[PDB]
Design a protein around this nucleic acid. Structure first.
Ligand SMILES: [Mg+2]
Lengths: 129, 160, 111, 157, 78
RNA sequence: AGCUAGUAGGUGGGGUAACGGCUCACCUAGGCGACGAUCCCUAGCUGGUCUGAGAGGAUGACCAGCCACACUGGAACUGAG
RNA sequence: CCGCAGAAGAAGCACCGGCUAACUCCGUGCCAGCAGCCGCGGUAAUACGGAGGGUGCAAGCGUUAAUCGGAAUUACUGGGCGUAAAGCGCACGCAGGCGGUUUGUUAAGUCAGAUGUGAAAUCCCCGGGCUCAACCUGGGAACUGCAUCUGAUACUGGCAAG
RNA sequence: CGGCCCCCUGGACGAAGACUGACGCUCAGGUGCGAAAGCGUGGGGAGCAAACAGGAUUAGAUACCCUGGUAGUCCACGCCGUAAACGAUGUCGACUUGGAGGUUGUGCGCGUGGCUUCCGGAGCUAACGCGUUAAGUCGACCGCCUGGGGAGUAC
């Protein structure tokens, strides 16, 4: 039984980038389309669409640059068995600012830089590099 | 015979200790305060070692030997702001005033040695005067005005 | 990893036994040098009777079979069961004569 | 302005019907004053011959990478053949803090402020391969902006 | 007014109420949030509770042995 | 691995500077406990000291805040204490 | 503070094959002995003892004992379980940990702001007098931990529910 | 766990239609099954054969070789909870180049499922090797490890 759809999406796109595939489909959710939107805003993918009505499908196409994968390391830091909550002043700097991290905060879903510039923190969920 | 990097590090360390007459625990506390100090460590430590009182007397020119300089310091012949100092590890602050005791005016051998030092070299700082027996500090010692055959990187790696 | 099992049973750090298993937290301990012969060892019953083996170094094989000696911790790496060393130079333990080098060793006085 | 620093000399031995044939192997890394590093693993029956073979191998396989004024662009983790190394940037008044082989290869590369630590095994060939792979996998803000499609100002803030 | 919210266990104590509260605390060396079932003894007026209902508790003066609590509101109607 | 019988609570009385099974009489038949009850071993606690890049680990003399004791074991009187 | 006198009375400890800093001569023949580890003594021991010299420290120097790091060698940060230590012989099942997707609500976890509170000395920075220093001392910062109030709802909790 | 037949009965899988609508996953404790050997009681006992006897090689042979043969191996009712109980790889899921096949269906001479065998791409390890049935990337949980002997040993 699957216990983490977000981590399943992350490992799906990671092995898709490793296999150099075109597109990937998955079941959808509000937090899934939110993290997909903030990932597109950060600029790691091109686009994502929702298909179907009774079973929403997040069809997303991957990105490649110079024959290499755009992402290098994706890691889920807020496990469903080990949640992680850090305040605003102790938000980490992934790769000293070169990487990125997703943070589920009180004002929706944003990144570490957006959380610092907005002035609030929350559950930091994933590291993307 | 050629010793490795640790060997040449300790050789340069003991060379500095021999040419400055400084024991090991003194240089260890010197390295401690230098690592406490701001900015760099090795060249600031060299500046502190230059700010050693016997070295500052030798490089002002009141004695052409650090041994007789320490002898004169122990005999209390250097008056900073009028008061004597017996301790050889006294640090000299910049733009200060140092003077020679009146009982130390009976001086000919180290005065001829001062003339010999004037014949040998002439640094930038440490203005000296043989007649008035006075002296002052001009500014901080420069890293380029610091003498050669000194390496800070191997020293700070040996004591790090 | 396995944080549920770790919070159910906590990670227990492994204990570290002392290399000197007799009269711990003590640099030098007393004792009676019984059997000062075989082959350079004494069976020392200490102040509480832990009955250690000790190695004798240098001269002084004529030490008394009931003599107060001091014991320091040290493995000889040449004999089994020898983990202690006699402290030559202590009370009732005649220091090794004719050893003018290593003054701190054997407690020898210099001329 | 290239530098010369040997890091490992070992004495291997093969067995033949006549007896034992001893040989000398030399690991030695070299490089330029900034960025370009390359390590060489030579093996011969004479020590200077093996040193020169390792030197030629290193000058052939000298790899290129960038940096940021004598420090890492970001903390990297070099993992190869059972050797974990941690490359981490530092402040200006630090120096070079690393192992033996890592300190030598970083002093060859010409960094000024890098703190490091070598976990895992302590094999010289393995740790130099690990730190070379870590430096090679280390990227730059310009190339990550070109890969993400954004600008350097948007990626810095 | 500093009241707390809890859940009772039994109500067969002849005008005495045993409550239990739960808290999620981050572990100081493991980080995993676990539960802490802190049980308390509460004094009531006329046995206005049943088995397993959510109530509100208030700290007051000591009324018996390790029982210095009073009931405020019942948000379950048992 | 089950423990507790003044045990857990209520009613009335006593007493304490003071609430309170604190203590009695009568009822209710319960209270705690694998989130470790009970039992056994060790141990004064904290600001701190050492060490460690950190998180931690070890350690509570001299300097201070709190607790307990004055050969051992029981008590109460004076006194505001 | 001032004078006086013959420099007058004022120096050792450990090691030199390597790790780890610096060599020779004699005794020595697995013997006495050294040794933290690799370990040495084959009538030539750079490794035992003696002589010199040098090395390192210095009114201290060696040895022992105790704690932390190195040790990622109890791994949350920061590890593994095919063959090196290590997947219960297998299955079912209670507590317990996790829970597919959407709406309404609570803020319990979560975060933001504010207030109170973390004795005083040590600790960090700026200064002062101790001949300098050790020492003590003024100010600042740290003590970010705890508690209360008001807000947020993305997610994890609960209910009504699809 | 395989000679055939009858009776009773479990589980698995396939193509479709409908319903319940998260009823789900691991499980500490507990329960059940659990190879062979062995034990208790009652039977049977052909062949094999622990123990044992004799003959052989051998320097000796309490062993390997033959001659016989008790227990056991066969049945029923209960214990015994141990194995190199191994795929030395715990269970449930998600995603990630292919060939050669085997078995068993279902649909339209061809398509898609379940299980399984061999080699190999990426990837992972110290290598051997694994490699869509991963030892690849992950998610949930349990169990076990942390130098060898002592020792799976004493109380
Ligand atoms: Mg037979």
């Amino acid at each position: 039984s699957m216990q983490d759809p977000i981590a399943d999406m992350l490992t799906r796109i990671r092995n898709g980038q490793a296999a150099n595939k075109a597109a990937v489909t998955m079941p959808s959710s509000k937090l899934k389309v939110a993290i997909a939107n903030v990932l597109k805003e950060e600029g790691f993918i091109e686009d994502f669409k929702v298909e179907g009505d009774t079973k929403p499908e997040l069809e997303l196409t991957l990105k490649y640059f110079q024959g290499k994968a755009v992402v290098e390391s994706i890691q889920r830091v807020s496990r469903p068995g080990l949640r992680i909550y850090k305040r605003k002043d102790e938000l980490p700097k992934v790769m000293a600012g070169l990487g990125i991290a997703v943070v589920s905060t009180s004002k929706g879903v944003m990144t570490d830089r957006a959380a610092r510039q907005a002035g609030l923190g929350g559950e930091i969920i994933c590291y993307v590099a | 015979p050629r010793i490795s990097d640790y060997g040449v590090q300790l050789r340069e360390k003991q060379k500095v200790r021999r040419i400055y007459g400084v024991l090991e625990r003194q240089f260890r506390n010197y390295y401690k305060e230098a690592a406490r100090l701001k900015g760099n460590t090795g060249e600031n430590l060299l500046a502190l070692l230059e700010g050693r009182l016997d070295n500052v007397v030798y490089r002002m020119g009141f004695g052409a030997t650090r041994a007789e300089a320490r002898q004169l310091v122990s005999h209390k012949a250097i008056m900073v702001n009028g008061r004597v100092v017996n301790i050889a590890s006294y640090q000299v602050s910049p733009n200060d005033v140092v003077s020679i005791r009146e009982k130390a005016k009976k001086q000919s051998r180290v005065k001829a040695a001062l003339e010999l030092a004037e014949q040998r070299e002439k640094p930038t700082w440490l203005e000296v005067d043989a007649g008035k027996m006075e002296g002052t500090f001009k500014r901080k010692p420069e890293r380029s005005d610091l003498s050669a055959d000194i390496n800070e990187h191997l020293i700070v790696e040996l004591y790090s | 990893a396995t944080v549920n099992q770790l919070v159910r049973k906590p990670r227990a750090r492994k204990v570290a036994k002392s290399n000197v298993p007799a009269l711990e937290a003590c640099p030098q301990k007393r004792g009676v040098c019984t059997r000062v012969y075989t082959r350079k060892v004494c069976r020392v019953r200490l102040t509480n009777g832990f009955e250690v083996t000790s190695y004798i170094g240098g001269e002084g094989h004529n030490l008394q079979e009931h003599s107060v000696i001091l014991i320091r911790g040290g493995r000889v790496k040449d004999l089994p069961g020898v983990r202690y060393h006699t402290v030559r130079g202590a009370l009732d333990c005649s220091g090794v004569k004719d050893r003018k080098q290593a003054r701190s060793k054997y407690g020898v006085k210099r001329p | 302005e290239l530098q010369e620093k040997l890091i490992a000399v070992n004495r291997v031995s093969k067995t033949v019907k006549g007896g034992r044939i001893f040989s000398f192997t030399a690991l030695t890394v070299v490089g330029d004053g900034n960025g370009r590093v390359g390590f060489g693993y030579g093996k011969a029956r004479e020590v200077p011959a093996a040193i020169q073979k390792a030197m030629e191998k290193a000058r052939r396989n000298m790899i290129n990478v960038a940096l940021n004024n004598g420090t890492l662009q970001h903390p990297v983790k070099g993992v190869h053949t059972g050797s974990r190394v941690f490359m981490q940037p530092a402040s200006e008044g630090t120096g070079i803090i690393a192992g033996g082989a890592m300190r030598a290869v970083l002093e060859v590369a010409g960094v000024h402020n890098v703190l490091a630590k070598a976990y895992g095994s302590t094999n010289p060939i393995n740790v130099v391969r690990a730190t070379i792979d870590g430096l090679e996998n280390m990227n730059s803000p310009e190339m990550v902006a070109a890969k993400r499609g954004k600008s350097v100002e948007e990626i810095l803030g | 007014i500093r009241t707390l919210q809890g859940r009772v266990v039994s109500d067969k104590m002849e005008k005495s109420i045993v409550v239990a509260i739960e808290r999620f605390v981050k572990h100081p060396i493991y980080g995993k949030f676990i539960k802490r079932t802190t049980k308390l003894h509460v004094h009531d007026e006329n046995n206005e509770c049943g088995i397993g209902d959510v109530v509100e508790i208030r700290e007051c003066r000591p009324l018996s042995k390790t029982k210095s609590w009073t009931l405020v509101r019942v948000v379950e109607k048992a």
